[PDB]
Design a protein around this ligand. Structure first.
Ligand code: HEM
Length: 258
């Protein structure tokens, strides 16, 4: 009956805190984690947790997300444990994952409460957006160390943009993020460009700064000429959904309509 849970991502760690659940290990991260986990040991960075550190804690459940399912497969092989890859690529996906965690770990009531609140904020933002006469066309960039990608509707930020009343200029939908060259950025006409950082936010922002100066295409974008290029903070605007989606939805709506 006793659970020993290791969340391997920051979003999963924050979700377990909302569900009032103790954990035996936590991800290594520069982000703020819940205070109740201050004394639990770190088991490595979310994209490459330490197999032997995790095994040392004798867990019953080691938890990851769907966004990096394929690349986490070797980890789980060496661990020799069941892969859990909760859907955190949308509001609806994360709501389903919260219910599942409530069911697995005896926190049904806590899960319902969190879900009702997120649902209520989402519906309210959706209702406001629907009353707006105009909707901005949006291009979403996800910058990682070394390069940038383009976020689709299948990604969390794509879902937020949709909820808040934007129209993604990128229409392909079969993966969360695609090469900056996959859809070609000379066929689109965004009112707004969003730039989200990942992994090494400092390296990423300077990378975005150099790109927009150096690559000749950007100066020709009306979003650039009109100063509607926005750098979003990685918290709450992360590479997956998180329980602060209430703040993300509200903030993005307020950015779009101001
Ligand atoms: C060169 C490319 C990349 C590098 C070097 C990198 C590095 C990192 C780092 C340092 C973190 C931990 C951030 C922290 O301290 O909290 C992280 C987390 C994560 N990354 Fe990446 N990343 C890269 C690309 C990607 C891409 C393309 C994806 C998705 C397709 C991805 C998915 C994730 C996920 C799901 C997490 C966990 C988020 C959480 O903790 O809630 N990464 N990565």
């Amino acid at each position: 009956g006793e659970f020993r849970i290791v969340p391997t991502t920051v979003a999963l760690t924050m979700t377990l805190d909302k569900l009032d659940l103790p954990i035996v290990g936590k991800p290594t991260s520069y982000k703020t984690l819940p205070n109740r986990y201050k004394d639990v040991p770190e088991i490595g960075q979310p994209m490459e947790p330490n197999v032997e550190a995790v095994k040392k804690l004798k867990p019953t459940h080691v938890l990851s997300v769907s966004t990096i399912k394929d690349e986490m497969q070797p980890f789980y092989k060496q661990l020799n444990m069941k892969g859990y890859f909760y859907d955190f690529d949308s509001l609806k996906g994360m709501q389903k994952s919260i219910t599942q965690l409530g069911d697995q770990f005896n926190r049904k009531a806590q899960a319902k409460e969190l879900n009702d609140h997120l649902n209520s904020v989402k519906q309210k933002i959706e209702n406001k957006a629907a009353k707006q006469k105009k909707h901005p066309k949006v291009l979403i960039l996800m910058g990682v160390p070394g390069s940038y990608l383009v976020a689709t509707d299948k990604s969390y930020i794509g879902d937020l943009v949709k909820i808040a009343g934007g129209e993604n200029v990128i229409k392909v939908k079969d993966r969360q993020y695609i090469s900056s060259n996959t859809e070609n950025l000379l066929n689109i006409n965004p009112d707004i460009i969003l730039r989200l950082p990942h992994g090494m936010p400092e390296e990423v922002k300077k990378m975005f700064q150099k790109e927009f100066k150096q690559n000749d295409i950007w100066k020709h974008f009306k979003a650039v000429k009109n100063n509607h290029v926005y750098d979003l903070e990685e918290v709450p605007f992360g590479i997956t959904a998180n329980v602060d989606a209430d703040k993300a939805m509200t903030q993005l709506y307020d950015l779009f309509y101001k």
